[PDB]
Symmetry: C2
């Protein structure tokens, strides 16, 4: 009988609560008057010396995570509030209602939400505490909370129940705080420049010309099929046509696709559009904004981070890797290395063959780095800037044949497709081969914040041509840690050309958004467009490997009961753990 | 051949643009340097006296809405920017490139986006203007803009194309500004009290126990059916269980139901939850917050509004109604009244029979009021407060039989169901009869902001019992203009009772959210819960009759071509209007 002990505990616990209620104690009182929060408490009363007790009577409340007694008249509780600890020293002599003191000191279970009213102090042991005159159960806990910490990594157990994870892994809260620090920073920056935050439809009657597979739904009264938005771009642009020069939306976007650790079915991005601005303006704006952000997380525009790349030469890095390997090991070519590495890798459910240095580097990245190697991302202005094609050309050795979409230029390009990367794919259209030639080539290293600008019209189907040098467009993509964080355009405002683009896109896909085309046919001002993924930026700044760390409730494949029975089984493996 | 003239115009206009480009003029330049906005312009240079010209050279840009010439060397343009007008006085003598002066002065079509660089001035006629040294087309308009104003009411033409409506009805922009003023006010109020703004899933794998019909969608990789959220309540509460004491979300909610002028398929609400608070705390918070809002729209906590109720006794109101009736008319009993009223009502596509005083009152409400009767909503603290049942009892004459869900109390209630309202419905369950007895009874008048508190447990399935007086719950509903604007609870935190409620709800409906139940089983702190509809509050504060006035792109039944051909037909009825 699996889950026997947990069931037993839950039932007995319910009994506890109803006997507590039977004795004239409300386990769920309506209002408890918290006079001060635990951080405020610490800020105010940390000046108290040892054995000193304040005359102030204050009242606090939080979750009990520890309950230890050195005596029947002296109990020590770790109360937690806003991810901050404060000891409650229950002394019977300093408690008014002695009867209630006994009933309460017995009733308190680990996990309970309690409130206490009494005097601040700092004990002889140095621990800042409160000596309660009174106190009560605000809400009883009916299950055994997992010990702290719990589930690291094991992302499944963590993100199945966020409400537990937040408690047993309070550090995680920081992430989400950071996340909002981001959006505030955005709002403050844009609102102060006269931007109007707006809301555009998530449900659309048109699928659109985008490739990405949308979620499909259906409205009944209208009896029409609707599609969840891929991007708010066109609506916002229609607002700019409407006469609202500066707009932005920090909205939820949806994609009916795959779920990686860098992809969630629904995610948050910000887009803004600004009349009479160009991508240069947006470049400075991006510099400024991100500067403000990382300064708001620190105080300076540089930010310390984890260096996950290991150097088989840096003996410090090697020493760190050995220290984190829960032992110590070394070799030269293989043999011993192979055995120890395969042992640890099999122990951590990792993979696979070779047992070589590559696996060592990977392990060092995904595990060791927290203990060791740091790095610094410099968000100081100005950011490094490069043109798309002259990075490629600088490095090739010389120019690319012009008419870049022509045969001669292509035939040029695969020469270095074979010479440099030794990687491509087919169909080798000019676009693809060029593109990540560029990306297993120059896209790394792009660790520091870097604008890659002036992409070819080959790469830019819906952009506006560059105002000077030919075959290029007025764009940029912001790269940090070898990834695209944000992007901007000197938006295309030619209605004729844009109609061509749209109607071509439609056929390449096989209706075209005629509404938008009408809108820009009514004259669309010169506009700067900007886009940023909030989730991914948050990932970067909180320094986390998984997108589930910055999304409170990521989309989970619901539990089929092999998962259920497994988990429940191991939780009673927990209670049997406590006893024997 | 319908739409002949519009097609002709569009084509000829495209010709105009390509001949302009052929002559060496870019109709869509990349970047124009706007040094100052039109409001900033007016703020800075309004001090200029008549015939006076500043030495300052500034550059501005916006949409041309008027193009008049008194001469071939003197032209007057109304440039519009941020819904603000500024005259451009093109004088050939004060323009450098004369060639460009002629080409440009001819090329400019009404609707174009133009930029000008020159000297501020105020003319002899008193009109603040700019005398351009140079200037250019930033983006040409390819259709004939409707005259200002256009489409009032005729909500279809308006809200089909928001980008046109914003231009020809710029006043509407105010609404949306107001709307954001609301949300900022919320954020500022909550963030300053240590609230963490968060984002919860819009896509859920569980339908829930709510009655409202959800949008249904499907994720492919997981191959599971998902449901759009009705409310974020449970997620947020799980966050409070998690240890984040104060959370809120200003999110998009979805309902797969009907589309009234007070209902949109997707709408925005704010919900917050605050540990160790009760509904009283929330009452004061609501007072404070809304006070701040209406003060931010005005400067004082009272707000002037339209009184749409007509008094067949107030001769001023009658005079107003006659003035707005595009003529003047009166009578006594009927006859003349019947004829004139039926004439005007048929003329405005209104309905229906009787031709009595009721129809007159209705018309006065929906049309006349803008010109006349005002009113003042007082958002000054404190708001009026009433208990649910003792309003009813005060007015009945005496108490209601207790055990209110019992037979005797019910049999009491329908006595006044027949005596007062002369309206009910069946099945006359205790709930329904009581409920809007109350609502065609005391729910009006509730014009001033008023908390209706302490609803019965009959009315409150998922609320927490009142801490003192029996059979009541700790709730409130905020009523303004006879409608529910916001609501709050001393949230139910009893896991046992809540499980009972949920599992009962499920059966009444015919899966139950077991996750949430687990969460609160792990002890849910005493919490205050609060909810507010942003769209509806915006409706109230902007003083508008339709929800489409506060939603940029409301959900529209796509055009079948009877609508299309009709509209296009009447737009060439427009161009034929200009000529003959």
């Amino acid at each position: 009988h699996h889950h026997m002990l947990s069931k037993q505990l839950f039932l007995n616990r319910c009994k506890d609560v109803e006997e507590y209620q039977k004795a004239g104690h409300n386990p769920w009182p309506h209002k408890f008057n918290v006079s001060i929060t635990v951080p405020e408490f610490i800020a105010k009363y940390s000046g108290l010396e040892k054995s000193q007790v304040s005359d102030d009577i204050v009242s606090v409340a939080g979750r009990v995570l520890s309950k230890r007694s050195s005596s029947s008249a002296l109990m020590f509780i770790d109360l937690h509030d806003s991810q901050t600890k404060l000891q409650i020293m229950l002394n019977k002599s300093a408690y008014e209602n002695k009867e209630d003191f006994v009933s309460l000191t017995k009733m308190i279970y680990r996990g309970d939400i309690c409130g206490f009213t009494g005097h601040p102090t700092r004990t002889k042991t140095g621990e800042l505490s409160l000596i309660p005159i009174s106190g009560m159960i605000l809400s009883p806990c009916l299950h055994m909370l997992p010990s702290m910490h719990y589930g690291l990594g094991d992302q499944e157990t963590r993100f199945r129940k966020r409400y537990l994870d937040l408690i047993v892994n309070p550090e995680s809260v920081k992430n989400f705080v950071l996340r909002t620090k981001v959006v505030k920073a955005v709002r403050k920056y844009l609102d102060d420049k006269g931007f109007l935050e707006v809301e555009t439809p998530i449900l659309n009657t048109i699928p659109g010309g985008a490739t990405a597979r949308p979620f499909i739904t259906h409205h009944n009264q209208l009896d029409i099929q609707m599609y969840m938005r891929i991007a708010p771009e066109l609506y916002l642009k229609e607002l700019v046509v409407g006469g609202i020069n500066r707009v932005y939306e920090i909205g939820r976007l949806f994609r009916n696709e795959g779920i990686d650790q860098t992809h969630n079915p629904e995610f948050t991005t910000c887009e803004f559009y600004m009349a009479y601005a160009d991508y240069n303006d947006i470049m400075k704006m991006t510099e400024e904004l991100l500067g403000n952000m990382v300064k708001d997380i620190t105080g300076g525009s540089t930010k310390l981070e984890i260096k996950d790349r290991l150097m088989d030469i840096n003996n410090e890095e090697d020493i760190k890797m050995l220290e984190k390997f829960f032992k110590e090991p070394i070799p030269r070519p293989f043999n011993s290395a192979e055995c120890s590495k395969v042992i640890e890798k099999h122990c951590t459910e990792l993979n696979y063959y070779y047992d070589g240095n590559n696996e060592k580097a990977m392990k060092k990245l995904f595990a060791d780095f927290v203990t060791e190697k740091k790095m610094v991302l410099d968000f100081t202005a100005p950011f490094k800037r490069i043109s798309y094609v002259h990075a490629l050309e600088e490095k090739f050795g010389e120019k690319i044949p012009r008419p870049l979409d022509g045969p001669e230029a292509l035939t040029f390009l695969k020469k270095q497709a074979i010479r440099f990367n030794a990687i491509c794919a087919e169909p080798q259209t000019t676009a693809r081969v060029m593109d990540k030639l560029f990306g297993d080539l120059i896209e790394v290293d792009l660790v520091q914040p870097t604008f890659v600008c002036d992409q070819p019209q080959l790469m830019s189907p819906l952009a506006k041509y560059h105002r000077s040098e030919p075959e290029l467009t007025e764009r940029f993509e912001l790269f940090i840690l070898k990834r695209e964080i944000a992007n901007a355009y000197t938006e295309l405002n030619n209605p004729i050309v844009q109609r061509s683009n749209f109607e071509q896109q439609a056929k390449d896909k096989a209706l075209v958004d005629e509404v938008f085309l009408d809108a820009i046919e009514h004259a669309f001002p010169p506009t700067g467009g900007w886009g940023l993924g909030i989730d991914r930026l948050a990932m970067l700044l909180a320094d986390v490997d998984n997108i589930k760390e910055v999304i409170l409730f990521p989309t989970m494949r619901p539990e089929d009961e092999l998962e259920k029975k497994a988990r429940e089984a191991k939780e009673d493996a927990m209670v049997a753990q406590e006893k024997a």
